[PDB]
A paper describes a structure:
In a HEPES-based buffer, prestin’s NLC shifts to depolarized potentials, associated to a more expanded state at 0 mV that is coupled to low anion affinity. Based on the above studies and the large size of HEPES anions, we assumed minimal binding of HEPES anions to prestin and hence associated HEPES condition to a putative apo state in this study. We associate the HEPES solvent condition to an apo state as the HEPES anion is too big to fit into the chloride site and prestin has a right-shifted NLC, To investigate further whether HEPES anion binds, we determined the structure of prestin in the HEPES-based buffer using cryo-EM. Our initial attempt to solve the structure in the complete absence of Cl− was unsuccessful due to sample aggregation under cryogenic conditions. Aggregated particles were greatly reduced in the presence of 1 mM Cl−, and we were able to solve the structure of GDN-solubilized prestin in 1 mM Cl−, containing 190 mM HEPES, at a nominal resolution of 3.4 Å. At physiologically relevant low Cl− concentration (1.5–4 mM), prestin’s binding site is likely to be only partially folded.
Prestin belongs to the SLC26 family of anion transporters yet is the only member capable of displaying electromotility. Prestin’s voltage-dependent conformational changes are driven by the putative displacement of residue R399 and a set of sparse charged residues within the transmembrane domain, following the binding of a Cl− anion at a conserved binding site formed by the amino termini of the TM3 and TM10 helices.
Author numbering:
A (entry chain A), B (entry chain B): 14 to 577, 619 to 722
Write the structure that this text describes.
Amino acid sequence: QRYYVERPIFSHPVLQERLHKKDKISESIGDKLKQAFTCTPKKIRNIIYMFLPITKWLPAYRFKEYVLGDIVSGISTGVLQLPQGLAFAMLAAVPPVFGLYSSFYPVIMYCFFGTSRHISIGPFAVISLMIGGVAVRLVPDDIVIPGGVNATNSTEARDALRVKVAMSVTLLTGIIQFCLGVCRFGFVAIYLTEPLVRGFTTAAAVHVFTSMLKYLFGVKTKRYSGIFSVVYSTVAVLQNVKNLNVCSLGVGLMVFGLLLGGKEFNERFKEKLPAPIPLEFFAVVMGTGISAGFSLHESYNVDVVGTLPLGLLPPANPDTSLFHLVYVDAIAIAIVGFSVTISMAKTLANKHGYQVDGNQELIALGLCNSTGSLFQTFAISCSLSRSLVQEGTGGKTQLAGCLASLMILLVILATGFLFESLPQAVLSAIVIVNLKGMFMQFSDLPFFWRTSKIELTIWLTTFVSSLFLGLDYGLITAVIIALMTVIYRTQSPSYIVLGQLPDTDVYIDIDAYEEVKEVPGIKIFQINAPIYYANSDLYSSALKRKTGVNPAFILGARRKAMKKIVTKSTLPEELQRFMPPGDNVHTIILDFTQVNFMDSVGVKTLAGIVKEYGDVGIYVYLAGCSAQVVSDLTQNQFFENPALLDLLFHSIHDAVLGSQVREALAEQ
Amino acid sequence: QRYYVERPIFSHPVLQERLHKKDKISESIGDKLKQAFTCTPKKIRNIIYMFLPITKWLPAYRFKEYVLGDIVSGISTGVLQLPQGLAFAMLAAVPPVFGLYSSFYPVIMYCFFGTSRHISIGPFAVISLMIGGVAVRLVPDDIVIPGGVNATNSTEARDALRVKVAMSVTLLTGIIQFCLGVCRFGFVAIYLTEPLVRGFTTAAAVHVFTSMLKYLFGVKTKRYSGIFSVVYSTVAVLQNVKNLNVCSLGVGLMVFGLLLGGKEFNERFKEKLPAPIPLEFFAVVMGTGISAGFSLHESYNVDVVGTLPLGLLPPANPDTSLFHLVYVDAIAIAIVGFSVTISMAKTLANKHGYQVDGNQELIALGLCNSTGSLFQTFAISCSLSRSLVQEGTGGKTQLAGCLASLMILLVILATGFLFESLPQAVLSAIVIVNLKGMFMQFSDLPFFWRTSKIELTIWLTTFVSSLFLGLDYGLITAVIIALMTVIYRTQSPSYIVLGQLPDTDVYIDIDAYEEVKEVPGIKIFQINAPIYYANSDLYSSALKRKTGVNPAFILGARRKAMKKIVTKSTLPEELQRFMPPGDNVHTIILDFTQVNFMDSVGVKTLAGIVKEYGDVGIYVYLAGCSAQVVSDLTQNQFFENPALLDLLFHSIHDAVLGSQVREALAEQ
Ligand SMILES: [Cl-]
Ligand SMILES: [Cl-]
């Protein structure tokens, strides 16, 4: 009922003498490998449930509740896949049909191999932009085809060569992703914080907006990429806005307005409506119907999707020769794609709670990309707005994605010619209106401003670095800056001078309470950070500052007054009332409860502190050293003198009692 | 004499109620600026003693003891400056005389502006190699001079253009260093640990060895630089070893042998010899005498220094136009130079102990470089072997460097033509033999292997990165890797399950002592690392593993048995002896004494842990939360329910007593 202890003062020697070490258990790397190579049925089942996750949940799928939600979610996400897929195919400098292949082959496989049950794997704009840049670089727009035969200008051969470049790029991306996954690369997903994921995603949103502005405005500018891409693209659009198409801009604007109104209607009418209406289906149908009936393309020169072929291309081995240079690109796409997909998988897991294993995620994506590259496709990561829509509608399982893949297959097989008249402005408006859920992530700035300025710094710096400095070189910069923020937290700790609560052993801050009173002749210093090379000199200077006791000025003042082995040396100064007034502190207790670790530089600084405080005549005691800290002290030869083991104490109260009893004994 | 406390169980509400907050002191940035703009005589003196350090020590120079040591040290360091200066001028693709200017103008100024009193500022090989590469790139060896007039081949105009390129490079380097120094860039010197500094210095030693191998062997290969420079240079030397000069190799080898024998003699005879003999003076004199008497250059084609001009060139403004491209180089030289000089300044300070302020170091070097760039010089950092020699001989003050500068001035003014016959092999041997003190730093591998494997990792990785990947891109990699080692220490902590020492409040590890016995029904978990985004899921998994209590399997087992707001929910399972045997733990105490900080991800994981443990029916208590940790918990909305403030406890014993009294009360 009451805190009552009556024990002797537990310094380091006393506690070590009262204890006996317990025998260690066997540790053998050979034994670690031993059980691994022994086959057991349970681990065999676990290997399968780890590599083929569909074997786990699909036989246990619940038909009572999940069926309706998955059907609705699949319908909505496929209705979103179609225009997003076509537009993202347009973004990749490839014929629009290959977007449909990109949205069918890798979707079905992720159902077999993937982990997250709320994630939609379709083409993504930034990866599509990278592939389009790769295609442009290898085969430029102004390329002379040796075939001839046909009249002036040709598009089929150039597009075929571009899609072959994409086939090599995505095959290399899939191979790299599979190799990373099998080499246990899923641990790196732990370094993508929520602040670093949300900033990255919002930067990607801005990039997509500025990329599709070109098609929204009907302008025919360049495809500036790399560093400073967003600003270059937006200024190129702004300069060439004089060549805008009034018809295309008008149809795009009315499509965007209808989409925004429908989204607002769905949000307001969430409760009474059993399921959100497929608004994008109405938008696409109305756009293609208006374009076909009014013949906008032949009338006023409106950009159109084109002719979407009707049929499944037979599996085809991709070129591996292009791997010569596409390698530097493939690696970037595989990094960016993995980062984005694991970011949203972690977001969905935090929202709901399930297995989000990144290793099997990378394995599944690597298998999908390669097993798709052989099927006339391109790089496929997780889509962002579509994933948000799928999770919002009520998506429960991955069968929703399979339904979307089935509907896209139906579009490829039967209704591929209905969208041959669909204007590109409709696709641009559909893509832009779906970024709204991603631009809503800008609300984190006030919340993080109120919560923690370091998290706000991470958010702002990843947003800026992934906006103005590309999206592939922005992720690495953001991760490094997050790690340096951790280092900064370790390099600017809270230096607290402690004080003793009366009649108790509670030691808390002296500047933040009135009961807390300092123990006469004793000053306690606390640092809530490890003492290592980065914050060692800072720790020593703060110790000299806060406690008000620095050996340098004390020794100098002894010298000025004179003008007119044992750890410490007693003061030999002749009795004189010329010392500047002070509290004649005899011991300085250092709090090591919060010090996690110490390296060689920290140990050297600690030895220097002890030596220079003992030269003046002031003891230094270490309170609450952890086992690891004592190991670092012993290994770095801090305890060469066995008498330095008496400085350590188990707690602050033990150190204070030791100092008091030492002073009492010294008087006698 | 004995640890005796009798206080009530201090949970968070009780302690907070017993305390009252103390009024904060005024904090105003305006007040910070206020006193800065007010002029006081003491701060005026301090500004001067900070910018002109010579005003501090020079009037207080002690003539009794320092004079002889400084004279000897200055003689030795100047005798080392001469051949090192000439060889490093040879390394920079500039006439050898400019090495003499590089060793006079910036040395005298550092005496006025520098801080460290044991540091020698002369030309350095790697900086000289960078400048020589800059000169080669801007003006190649095969350049057509429009002057004509003279016969085939010309060297004066090409060398003048090269030295003008060096004049722009070093002026930009000095300007950049001064700007960094005045912008308070000396804080970055805290991130250069000893393991990193020593690895960097040994890599520089290997680079210098492989660079001067070319002159030692008499081979006339290329000047490969950049990435993979050491291997390229050494293979180029090895392939062309068939064109070696027997005479030059022989004289270089005998010079090296004489130098090594003299060094061994000096080391063995340290006590009886009043002062080390100037061995390099004998070596240079003998080499030039033999070359002049035997006429090696005209006889057997031995490489020679050349003609060293006799006179001081009048101050001359350097070109600023070359700053167009030399900028990318100048910045690299200023970084590498500052890193090296602050590394050895810190090493000397740790050896002795004095002011090593890096800001004034950068200011002094920036002033020296620019004020020399205007005097026909090049980039000048701290020399390594020469600094070691100066500190070893007994150098006390910077007047030793001034003596070396004076002797170099005498060489320039009077005896500049004595060394016109000195072979380059002698210079190469002299430079190589002085690296011995730097190759002795390889002994850190066993010491760091015994002491700490992470420090050994830092040492090895900085050595490899600064050896095989250049010296300018190696420093940044080493610093980043050191910071990631800190992050790794935070991501692999020691998960310790604690136990109670009998009849006392000491809680220590349960697997490392026999007295330590676990409190029945209570399991204590300790992590000596902050709970943040990097090690949050790892912490939760370790909590489930070590303590043997995971809510997932417990709930699953309740479900299997069934087959046959308040923070926690009591167990409703009907009384059945089908639970797998356990210790029916009722509370799990988490130790937060060693947790420095928590971010949003850590708080979310902690809330999830508390919720999922309360669903089963097991309390979770937090023991020893710091003020900063409680602030992070409160800001991140962990304490939205006021009942969660009762979970916090001041110490482990308080939490154990609270759990015991709660269990006792529950029975009644
Ligand atoms: Cl998107
Ligand atoms: Cl050197």
